[PDB]
Write a protein that binds this ligand. Structure first.
Ligand SMILES: Nc1nc(SCC(=O)NCCN2CCCCC2)nc2sc3c(c12)CCCCC3
Ligand SMILES: Nc1nc(SCC(=O)NCCN2CCCCC2)nc2sc3c(c12)CCCCC3
Ligand SMILES: Nc1nc(SCC(=O)NCCN2CCCCC2)nc2sc3c(c12)CCCCC3
Ligand SMILES: Nc1nc(SCC(=O)NCCN2CCCCC2)nc2sc3c(c12)CCCCC3
Ligand SMILES: [Cl-]
Ligand SMILES: [Cl-]
Ligand SMILES: [Cl-]
Ligand SMILES: [Cl-]
Ligand SMILES: [Cl-]
Ligand SMILES: [Cl-]
Ligand SMILES: [Cl-]
Ligand SMILES: [Cl-]
Lengths: 396, 396, 396, 396
């Protein structure tokens, strides 16, 4: 068992491991696009004597955090151990090497989408965003009097072929990702990939349609099997008007019984309707997971709630450092100290708090976050909260 | 069509209307217990010429709000129009009369549990708490190292017959309801009713069991049809230790595949497990609905976040008054004014904000809450938030 | 194997055979009511050497036929062979003896409800009425402008306890059964039985409610398991106004998603709605089966379409006689002849034609009805048709 | 918003609207065949300022009506409003313009297949044929002694590839459509299309097989997912012998559990079996919808029952004219009058009566058809009835 950077000869062995480990595999011909996001030394493989029995890599990503700050992010992906080589500490070795490389390269944070919720906590990954599926029975949906864009005149929304309006979608997304915590820069190769999935596949997914507004878009397709269900794959709205106009159009798909979307807990859609209950939550799951690589750099980089008074404390991350933490005027200063710790938590807990998706009070109730001062807990709660609700950009 | 207070002769007609309008009817012999909570003049009926074709009443309740303040609450229940008399404005007439009576009696707030989510908004009722069903696959559930009560020695939890420990359940509940927003005083007649439902019914519900801790309890029964599913009907925990100890015991029901509970969004259970995903959200719905009867009295009665600086504004409720609102040191002063309104909202929106379950930002995004100052929105958000997460006490 | 009339000692053996042969058994204590409709010599049993291994009886019924004529009808019921004694010609022997008795007693027709559709044809029983289940999604149901009782004022329909309005239901039913082909006289013992099934059963059927009009009623209960489905067990309407008023009330059961009723193919309900498709046909099956015992007596007893000119023919029933048939002024004369047969059919086919539910053309297309004159076929079609659509009264 | 005839440049915009409005879309390359049936000025589109936001067209069809008379029929199809432009009266404007064009062109009737049952009544379209799905459990199916083609010798039915016997299918269909009310002329381009759907599609529909008789054919394929179910897509039989022979062959598909067919209520198949119940009705729905464009021309063009005596009346269609109607010797004369109306009905009701599928008595019971003379109702019933049962030709 050897652990090293893959050579060009190693990749066919990696794609074989990938096909047997991931069911949703797009093959090795759309792997060209995703490979461009893997830096030199971004990947590790484990050989037996010889076939690939273990692999893992990171991708160079740009992650928006509260205060509209953009962090270089190491995106963990393509992590697999052969079924022949389980319970052999290969994952632990591969994860330890990549984290070494990611830290030495100067990434403040790493991120991943979890295949299971029970693996990544012990690696210091905490769930940081929440996926929220809403299903609307659009046959009963009436918009509230208070809702925008209910007046006469034309709709500002057009039904369009996605492939013909790439430039417009990019510019809306680019604005969206820069102003929303959880936002990711979407490179050109991923727009290429997104608009190739937009066409109908033979005995597969149906043609994608687009609803386009000056300040928003929605990509949707009818479900393969349930022909009364429209799945919104992606809805990006920069303004409240765009979000309403796009939903007014989706509720007007008169041949559909149900619109479903994977969105965030704070999606205002339920409040646009006279009956909030018509937008049922049909699924909830952790979205993006964060490992804080550098505590001082990550805590100093993000903005904090202006609405909490200046305060100071000592934060200990288990095997991650102890820090004098001082937060005021929505900025933090995080400096080394050996003074008595007022707050203790494992590294994964800090990832979970970092984007505002989880409350310090909630993690404290489960004893994942230790302090003896409930005042300090209320202050952490308020300071780490996000004015702009945290969303999930796209799976990697 | 006449609208008046029912006489003793009217109640058999009301029970007939009730049987035909509500499927979950416990009959007229457990209606004796619930009737004790209806004050003199708490009920209206509509007769045709003569049978009961319309009814509605309120019950005298005590509702805990943020700051551990207990408000007299008019609990709307038993609202029905005969299928023979729909679309005749009977509900509008009955609701207008009860609201007249509730206001004149000096109730600051009214509350209800909604049969449908599309009826009650136009009456100034906003959804104020969120029901959150968690289902645990307890076969995979391992408690986190950080979780409390994982050490050796005895369990502080006992498996007991509910009927034999009424006094203990009352005292824990009484502590719970006083410290939690959404908490309701549970009168003796409702403890009588709760412990009569605890015994097995012939070709019906199975026997209820209780897990008792000094500072918490859990009532659960196996599902009628799914014999691998335990439904926790009620879990009241005053301390984090009690909540963990009770969940450790429930995860030890080795003959069950699944534990389900209807809880609140901030339940710390997912964070007690090594795999947060094992506690799936399988259902979400609005719980208690609030109508603010008296805006000044309700806004002044509750506590506000100490962690936001003193601030002042002018609040207009549509057909509910305009008010100079001044919040600081976690107290509000709400006084009449004709000065230009900075915040506008319908009455139902204020009910939705009142217990901290919904964010002003979220309601603002849907244009249910109008202001031109985003700073003022952040301040409302922070001030109306609840330190103690809001829960739902019991259905009425 | 002996075939004779049962003695009082034989009935416990018959009830044992009944319990093992029929799953929907109401026991031997509601068998007292149904036994009153069995005449002396109405029953046969087969013993082995001794237990009951075979039984069959008829009940004295009154059946309305086209022209509002009421015929004495032998109602076959309680027919069973022990699982120990199949393929032994016991059914053939029992059916031959009862038919001997029924004919000698002077019954023009026999009738039954079929447990299977493949048994009774060879005994000369033809399906004569059609059961038609309509399910309305009442959430979309709007009444047509043209529909009756859409104006202001009170509803003429009352929601009532069935047990309190027995007299009213009897008088409406009594009018209904006399004016509708397929109508049965419902004796007092069967009203006793019907209103005992109207109360809720412990871990069984839910309480029955009644909608009462001067000229109609509807009995309905919520389904045991599907709590959004109301089953209308029985709807008797003497006028079009009563039928609409009752359906307006049923569509007003706002807690239900679906109303289902077992009705007849010509039920006007679909045409009362702006969307005829909302009343889906979810089930169709043969209802009452007729064996014509005496061809001349049965053909002469019923009325014929006044709208077809006088005509004459020769009808042969296979092993049932040949007859000169002369129809005009809505009366028939049926007399013996040896003249060449113009129409041939088995006896079961005549039962199927007798109430107007099946067209001679349709049975001719399947060669169940032979003639060489298509003019004569059109004339039979028109003459045997029923002005008043044929309905099914009640199962026996 | 402009309403005009589409130009060649408008059609790609129409196909985009079509893809987003209809899930069962065959694309724009089989749209060439269907476009040949659209006359010059057969289509309208609505543009916004510019994309197609509304479209509708008619096709030139030939519809057989009672008396084997063939009417030029305007077949409405391809009707869609963009989800962006609902509740803007675009459908009303497009339908009013096409109906203007259809009337001025001299079409006596228009027809459509309804996407929903609640749209087309207000446009004067009445459901005129009834689709009836029969499912046979062919494992229990035994043919009656009386049924044709049960004797020895060869089967007159051959199992064949459809593509190799186009000429034979055309000639049988051509005979069928000319002798059956509801029959449509099937042009060459639609035979091209029908035999292209007969071959297996990759990850789609299975290969179609044909059973060919001198006087009938049946096209069937195994269901995609249920491999024990054969769907008969089309069965055309000119004689009773052909219908039996084809069904004898289908019942001989020994690898199938179930044969299903969409047929008409008067299909004689149930009567060919010893057990009529084995042919279950598993689905019922309205088929073709008729709008009578010219009342006098349509009423005079069709044949009437010879078996009803000569009679005269005055018929008023709401906003459609008042007419002296005189029916005798199976012909009608329909002439202008201002004499008192004896029969009133909306235009849609007349479409529903026109092919004999619905009885005047049934529509009268729902007050869709007003008269004060029940004798006149019986006469309408009998006269409008169809000797040959009405069938549905093919969807457009
Ligand atoms: N990181 C990549 N993503 C995608 S599609 C976006 C997505 O939903 N990912 C979650 C699921 N995921 C799909 C297959 C892989 C592993 C698991 N496609 C590819 S292809 C590929 C990579 C990759 C990884 C980086 C470069 C090697 C080849
Ligand atoms: N307010 C009452 N609650 C209950 S059980 C607790 C519950 O889950 N209620 C929601 C469902 N609900 C059950 C039946 C009634 C209306 C709807 N039982 C009764 S019985 C009764 C009332 C009442 C209302 C007040 C006094 C008259 C009789
Ligand atoms: N003829 C009778 N009907 C009924 S309930 C009405 C009904 O839906 N019948 C169809 C089903 N059926 C139920 C049980 C018996 C056989 C099959 N109950 C009884 S009880 C009984 C008879 C009978 C038959 C005549 C007298 C002996 C005892
Ligand atoms: N009238 C047409 N029919 C068909 S397939 C036969 C069928 O089952 N139609 C009902 C469903 N229908 C399918 C797609 C269209 C609208 C709805 N295909 C096409 S393609 C097409 C038309 C058309 C309409 C006339 C010319 C433009 C393009
Ligand atoms: Cl690489
Ligand atoms: Cl996503
Ligand atoms: Cl009272
Ligand atoms: Cl609850
Ligand atoms: Cl007897
Ligand atoms: Cl029945
Ligand atoms: Cl054209
Ligand atoms: Cl068809």
């Amino acid at each position: 068992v050897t652990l090293c950077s893959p050579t060009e000869d190693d990749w066919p062995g990696m794609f074989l491991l990938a096909a047997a480990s991931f069911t949703d595999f797009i093959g090795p011909e759309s792997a060209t696009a995703w490979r461009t996001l893997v830096p030199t030394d971004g990947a590790v493989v484990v050989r037996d004597g010889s076939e690939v029995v273990g692999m893992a890599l990171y991708m160079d990503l740009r992650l928006t955090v509260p205060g509209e700050v953009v962090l270089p992010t190491a995106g963990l992906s393509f992590v697999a151990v052969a079924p022949t080589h389980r319970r052999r500490g290969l994952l632990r070795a591969m994860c330890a090497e990549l984290h070494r490389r990611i830290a030495d390269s100067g990434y403040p944070v790493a991120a991943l989408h979890a295949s299971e919720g029970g693996i990544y906590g012990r690696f210091g990954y905490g769930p940081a965003t929440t996926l929220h599926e809403l299903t609307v029975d659009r046959r009963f949906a009436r918009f509230h009097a208070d809702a925008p864009g209910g007046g006469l005149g034309g709709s500002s929304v057009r039904l369009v072929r996605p492939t013909e309006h790439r430039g417009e979608f990019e510019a809306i997304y680019e604005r969206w990702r820069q102003q929303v915590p959880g936002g990711l820069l979407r490179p050109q190769v991923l727009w290429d990939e997104l608009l190739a999935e937009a066409k109908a596949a033979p005995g597969g997914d149906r043609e994608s349609f687009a609803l386009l507004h000056p300040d928003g878009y929605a990509l949707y397709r009818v479900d393969r099997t349930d022909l009364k269900l429209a799945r919104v794959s992606e809805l990006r709205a920069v303004t409240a008007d765009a979000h309403c106009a796009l939903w007014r159009a989706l509720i007007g798909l008169d041949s559909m019984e149900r619109i479903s979307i994977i969105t965030h807990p704070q999606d205002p859609l339920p409040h646009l309707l006279t009956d909030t209950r018509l937008a049922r939550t049909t699924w909830r799951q952790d979205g993006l997971w964060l490992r804080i690589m550098n505590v001082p750099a990550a805590l100093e980089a993000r903005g904090y709630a202006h609405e909490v008074g200046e305060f100071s404390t000592v934060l200990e991350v288990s095997d991650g450092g102890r820090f004098a933490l001082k937060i005021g005027d929505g900025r933090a200063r995080c400096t080394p100290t050996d003074a008595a710790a007022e707050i203790e938590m494992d590294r994964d807990v800090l990832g979970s708090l970092y984007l505002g998706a989880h409350r310090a009070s909630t993690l404290a109730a489960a004893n994942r976050l230790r302090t003896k001062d409930s005042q300090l807990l209320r202050r952490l709660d308020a300071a780490f909260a996000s004015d702009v609700p945290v969303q999930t950009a796209f799976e990697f």
